[PDB]
Amino acid sequence: GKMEKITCVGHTALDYIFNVEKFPEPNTSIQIPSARKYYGGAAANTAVGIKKLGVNSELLSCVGYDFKNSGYERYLKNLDINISKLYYSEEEETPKAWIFTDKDNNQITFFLWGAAKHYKELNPPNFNTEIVHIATGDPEFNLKCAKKAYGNNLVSFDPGQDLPQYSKEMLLEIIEHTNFLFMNKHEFERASNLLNFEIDDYLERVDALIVTKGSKGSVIYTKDKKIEIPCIKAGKVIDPTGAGDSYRAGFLSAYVKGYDLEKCGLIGAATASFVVEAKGCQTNLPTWDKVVERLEKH
Amino acid sequence: GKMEKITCVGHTALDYIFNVEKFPEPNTSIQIPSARKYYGGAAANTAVGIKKLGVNSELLSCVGYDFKNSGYERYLKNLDINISKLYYSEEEETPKAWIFTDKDNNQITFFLWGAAKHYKELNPPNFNTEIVHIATGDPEFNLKCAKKAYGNNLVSFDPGQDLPQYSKEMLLEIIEHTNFLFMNKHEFERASNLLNFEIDDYLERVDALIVTKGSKGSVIYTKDKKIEIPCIKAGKVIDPTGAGDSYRAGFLSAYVKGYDLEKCGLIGAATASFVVEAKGCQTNLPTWDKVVERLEKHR
Numbered sequence: 001g002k003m004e005k006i007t008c009v010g011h012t013a014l015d016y017i018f019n020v021e022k023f024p025e026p027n028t029s030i031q032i033p034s035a036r037k038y039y040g041g042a043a044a045n046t047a048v049g050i051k052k053l054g055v056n057s058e059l060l061s062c063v064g065y066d067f068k069n070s071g072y073e074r075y076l077k078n079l080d081i082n083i084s085k086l087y088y089s090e091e092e093e094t095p096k097a098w099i100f101t102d103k104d105n106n107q108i109t110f111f112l113w114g115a116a117k118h119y120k121e122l123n124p125p126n127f128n129t130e131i132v133h134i135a136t137g138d139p140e141f142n143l144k145c146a147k148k149a150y151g152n153n154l155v156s157f158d159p160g161q162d163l164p165q166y167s168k169e170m171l172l173e174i175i176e177h178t179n180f181l182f183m184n185k186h187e188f189e190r191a192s193n194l195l196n197f198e199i200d201d202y203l204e205r206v207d208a209l210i211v212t213k214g215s216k217g218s219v220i221y222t223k224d225k226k227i228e229i230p231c232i233k234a235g236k237v238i239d240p241t242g243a244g245d246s247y248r249a250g251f252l253s254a255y256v257k258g259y260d261l262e263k264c265g266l267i268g269a270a271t272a273s274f275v276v277e278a279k280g281c282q283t284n285l286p287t288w289d290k291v292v293e294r295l296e297k298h
Numbered sequence: 299g300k301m302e303k304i305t306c307v308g309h310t311a312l313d314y315i316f317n318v319e320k321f322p323e324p325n326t327s328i329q330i331p332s333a334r335k336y337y338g339g340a341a342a343n344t345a346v347g348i349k350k351l352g353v354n355s356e357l358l359s360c361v362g363y364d365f366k367n368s369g370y371e372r373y374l375k376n377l378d379i380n381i382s383k384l385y386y387s388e389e390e391e392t393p394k395a396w397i398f399t400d401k402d403n404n405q406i407t408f409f410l411w412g413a414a415k416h417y418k419e420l421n422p423p424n425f426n427t428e429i430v431h432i433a434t435g436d437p438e439f440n441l442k443c444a445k446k447a448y449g450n451n452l453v454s455f456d457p458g459q460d461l462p463q464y465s466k467e468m469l470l471e472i473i474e475h476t477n478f479l480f481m482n483k484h485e486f487e488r489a490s491n492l493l494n495f496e497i498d499d500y501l502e503r504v505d506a507l508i509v510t511k512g513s514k515g516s517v518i519y520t521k522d523k524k525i526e527i528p529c530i531k532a533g534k535v536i537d538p539t540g541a542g543d544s545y546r547a548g549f550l551s552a553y554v555k556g557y558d559l560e561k562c563g564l565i566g567a568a569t570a571s572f573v574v575e576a577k578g579c580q581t582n583l584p585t586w587d588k589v590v591e592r593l594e595k596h597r
């Protein structure tokens with residue numbers, strides 16, 4: 001691991017938002033004009049944010065036969081994100097979330113696993129990047145990645161919504177091969193209960209535990225110190241989703257650019273502040289200069 | 299209208315079809331292992347089943363920028379289905395359905411209208427077919443079709459999943475220009491609540507009212523009589539989705555082939571029994587010989 005470059009491993013996924021009046025009762029149908037498409041998936045959100053910040057990124061994801069000359073493939077190619085490590089299924093569609101949201105803002109999500117079925121027949125390559133960041137995807141494959149990369153590339157891990165799938169054993173084992181561990185508060189609360197861990201137990205295993213708290217900021221724990229990172233004010237909150245992935249993008253981009261962990265947290269906080277300003281996880285990702293400028297005022 | 303042919307008016311669509319044990323509640327997520335899109339849309343489904351039964355069909359639908367030279371178009375053309383009257387949008391996508399089936403084969407659907415927004419800009423052509431079958435779609439365009447066709451071509455009407463879009467007044471007016479009216483048990487209930495109609499009110503306006511009841515069969519009401527149509531066993535029920543439209547394809551094909559209303563119902567029922575054996579509304583559409591062979595095994 002040597003090049004100014006981060007590998008993101010895990011979901012590259014299409015999200016489709018369906019705004020409805022009311023969800024259908026049994027034996028009924030609803031009709032809607034259209035669904036809005038968004039480029040998502042935790043790994044691809046992070047990879048695209050890293051690239052936007054001027055750090056080369058590569059993606060390792062299982063995509064499907066619709067990926068494939070369509071919108072998502074060309075959009076990534078256009079941003080110069082390395083997608084040479086993608087696995088292309090002939091049998092299944094690209095993972096995607098179909099998100100149906102009513103007028104009172106209640107939501108029902110159908111996630112298509114689809115091409116992600118292929119991870120269990122795959123094994124990770126040697127990585128040549130400074131950091132291998134492991135996001136939602138297939139936990140067994142993600143553990144293979146962490147075990148292969150650790151002690152060679154820096155490992156970043158953010159189990160996210162996959163958390164419930166990890167056994168205590170398996171979660172322990174991946175954390176033992178992790179350098180940066182990121183979790184939101186609910187995730188951290190969940191994992192700690194599983195593992196019977198307190199903060200000090202994590203720090204016996206990882207170099208930095210980062211717990212994000214949305215609008216209340218974040219905190220970085222190291223063997224040495226606790227670093228409190230403020231929330232950075234957005235222009236106006238539209239879609240609070242994608243704040244997660246983009247904080248990770250900022251943090252890891254800053255780390256590869258050679259800044260200390262405090263400033264990495266600050267850049268993370270400032271990156272996320274741009275992302276909440278629009279619908280979609282990738283639609284308002286900032287440049288490095290814009291991040292540094294926003295941080296400069298607050 | 300005099301060609302031994304049927305016009306099908308209404309949606310052509312791509313369908314995702316899912317099996318769940320129970321329908322998800324508000325504020326909940328479900329993972330689907332695997333999904334595939336199927337050729338769908340009520341009007342297209344009927345037009346394909348009709349052709350498969352050996353009756354010429356034509357299709358009128360609004361399709362999207364994902365149609366000209368795509369897999370669906372080439373498939374319909376390969377079928378010798380007249381698609382010359384289709385409207386291709388330049389900016390809207392082909393309509394799409396997400397269909398969920400629970401363990402008791404209840405279904406819910408979500409339907410993206412897309413190119414069907416264009417119906418408000420269009421008017422029907424003259425029809426030269428024996429039957430014009432209106433299968434879902436836009437209420438105002440459908441009323442134009444029925445008013446256009448009525449007393450010239452036989453009008454069959456099956457508002458289907460789009461029924462909620464009909465005001466009482468528009469639904470009433472289309473029925474007054476309808477010869478054959480087809481509804482699900484669910485649709486018939488809602489329709490009758492909306493209209494405040496009993497069976498005989500329908501029969502003052504239409505020649506035949508066909509109410510299907512899934513695995514309980516169906517009933518044909520005319521001014522003269524009530525004809526009970528049994529459910530005809532299928533071999534292993536996989537997907538109920540295509541049952542409704544393939545019943546209309548069988549019923550209307552048999553009608554054009556000159557058989558009486560009872561036999562039309564029996565043919566609809568046996569056609570549907572084949573379609574429910576595979577996922578996708580058009581996957582296991584049967585030939586006329588297969589359907590008849592199955593029918594005579596009954597009775």
Ligand SMILES: Nc1ncnc2c1ncn2[C@@H]1O[C@H](COP(=O)(O)OP(=O)(O)NP(=O)(O)O)[C@@H](O)[C@H]1O
Nearest residue numbers: 184212213214215217218241242243244247269272
């Ligand atoms: N409303 C907000 N305004 C400004 N910055 C925010 C806001 N919400 C979050 N952030 C920043 O972005 C980071 C990520 O928030 P986070 O706690 O990970 O959200 P989350 O619980 O993961 N929800 P999601 O982003 O949809 O997965 C935080 O550490 C905040 O600094």
Ligand SMILES: Nc1ncnc2c1ncn2[C@@H]1O[C@H](COP(=O)(O)OP(=O)(O)NP(=O)(O)O)[C@@H](O)[C@H]1O
Nearest residue numbers: 405510511512513515516532539541542567570571
């Ligand atoms: N399980 C079955 N096996 C054999 N034939 C069936 C079965 N279910 C339905 N049919 C036939 O198909 C006809 C139409 O059923 P139908 O009343 O349209 O069900 P449905 O609720 O509309 N399906 P859907 O609208 O997609 O949820 C019936 O009258 C039956 O003859």
Ligand SMILES: Nc1ncnc2c1ncn2[C@@H]1O[C@H](CO)[C@@H](O)[C@H]1O
Nearest residue numbers: 011013015040041042097111136161
């Ligand atoms: N249940 C789930 N499991 C894994 N990934 C998901 C799930 N729901 C949504 N995602 C994807 O992950 C990203 C954020 O977690 C979104 O862009 C979305 O596509």
Ligand SMILES: Nc1ncnc2c1ncn2[C@@H]1O[C@H](CO)[C@@H](O)[C@H]1O
Nearest residue numbers: 029311338339340395407409434459
């Ligand atoms: N709400 C709806 N409006 C119109 N057509 C629908 C709806 N839901 C499902 N469909 C379609 O009806 C068919 C079954 O009759 C499917 O092929 C599907 O495309």
Ligand SMILES: [Mg+2]
Nearest residue numbers: 176204205206
């Ligand atoms: Mg260790």
Ligand SMILES: [Mg+2]
Nearest residue numbers: 160161244245
């Ligand atoms: Mg997250």
Ligand SMILES: [Mg+2]
Nearest residue numbers: 458459542543
């Ligand atoms: Mg129907």
Ligand SMILES: [Mg+2]
Nearest residue numbers: 474502503504
């Ligand atoms: Mg009359």
